Amino acid sequence: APNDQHYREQWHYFDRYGVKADKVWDMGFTGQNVVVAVVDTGILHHRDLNANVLPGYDFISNSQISLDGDGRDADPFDEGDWFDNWACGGYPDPRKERSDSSWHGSHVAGTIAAVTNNRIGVAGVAYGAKVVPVRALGRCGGYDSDISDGLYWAAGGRIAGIPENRNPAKVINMSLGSDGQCSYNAQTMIDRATRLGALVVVAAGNENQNASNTWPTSCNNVLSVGATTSRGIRASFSNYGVDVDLAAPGQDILSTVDSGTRRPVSDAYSFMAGTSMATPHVSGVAALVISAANSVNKNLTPAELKDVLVSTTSPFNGRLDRALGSGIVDAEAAVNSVLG
Ligand SMILES: [Ca+2]
Ligand SMILES: [Ca+2]
Ligand SMILES: [Ca+2]
């Protein structure tokens, strides 16, 4: 249905092992009046995002990470997390020497709610929804405490020195994480966000390791997402195991980025792979589900929304080599479930 130039390439919306977002748009549900926060590298000023981006906030405290000249500020612009000369560091490993800017937060944001039916570029899973960019990641990643403050604020939590969020999110997408157990502080903020009514949707990670060995997956009250391929099998790099709740397409995912290698230069589109790409598919479907639930006067708690998403998955291609939740997220079965 969408008129967008490169929609045809987004197999992950509509093909055999896609999320069946097409079958839900056919029902008139697009995630209208749903707000999804993206706790990530920030947002590009991209012709195929602008319309669907709401005021966010920049939680990065170290100015050597943010690359914008100060700590916390009201502008969640992705300056570009590029680096060279082993700035992150790991010298002398040549594979850690340098990286071009990822535009990670925008690729993720486009999956959720890229401007759709405007002819240019691509579509989003919940293109009737809106995105609040919570910038917590810059050069070399981010601090746990910036991430945790950011996710609490995303839900509507007040933080001293930060103007109240006018746009609290029902769904908080965290395409991020690292090695180690969930911290006391991060768990606490997740629990407070969940009590505010937000579903916290997180990436399993990309180290071909048991996702239980990582945060946010090892936290309570998150929905952890593994990555599958166009063939319906576990993508090679996807973390795995009992604490992965479900999976979504995380290989050859087309979305919105910039062509700049350092700072933004011009709007572009690219294929990426990672549980990071899978995660916003689930965040996008969560928003579709909520817009369907709204239409029948049905409120859903984060726990209930998570159960709908996990219980209505489509099957994998055979069994997998590792556990990856119940199936692949399925917007049609998820939405049909809440409409009776
Ligand atoms: Ca700043
Ligand atoms: Ca900023
Ligand atoms: Ca578009």
Numbering used by the authors: 2 to 341
What does the literature reporting this entry say, word for word?
Dichelobacter nodosus is a Gram negative, anaerobic rod that is the principal causative agent of ovine footrot, a debilitating disease of the hoof of ruminants. In strains that cause virulent footrot these proteases are called acidic protease isoenzymes 2 and 5 from virulent strains (AprV2 and AprV5) and basic protease from virulent strains (BprV). All of these proteases are synthesised as inactive precursors with an N-terminal pre-pro-region, a serine protease domain and a C-terminal domain of unknown function. AprV2 adopts a subtilisin-like fold consisting of a curved six-stranded parallel beta sheet sandwiched between two and five alpha helices.
To investigate how the single amino acid difference (Y92R) between the active forms of AprV2 and AprB2 alters the substrate specificity of AprB2 we determined the crystal structures of AprV2 and AprB2 to 2.0 Å and 1.7 Å, respectively. The two structures were very similar (RMSD of 0.28 Å for 339 Cα) and therefore we will describe the structure with reference to AprV2. The proteases have two disulphide bonds, Cys89-Cys141 and Cys183-Cys220 and three calcium binding sites. The most striking feature of the substrate binding site is a large, elongated S1 binding pocket, which is lined by residues 177–180, 204–208, 215 and 218, and appears capable of accommodating bulky side-chains such as phenylalanine. This finding is consistent with previous studies, which have shown that AprV2 preferentially cleaves after phenylalanine or leucine residues. Comparison with other subtilisin-like proteases reveals several major insertions (termed I1-I4) in the loops that surround the active site cleft. Most notable is the large well ordered I2 loop (residues 82–102) that is tethered to the subtilisin-like fold by a disulphide bond between Cys141 and Cys89. The loop is well defined in the electron density, with low B-factors, suggesting that it has limited mobility in the crystal structure. However, the apparent stability of the I2 loop is likely to arise from crystal packing and it is uncertain if this conformation would be favoured in solution. We therefore propose that the I2 loop functions as an exosite, mediating the formation of a stable enzyme-substrate complex.
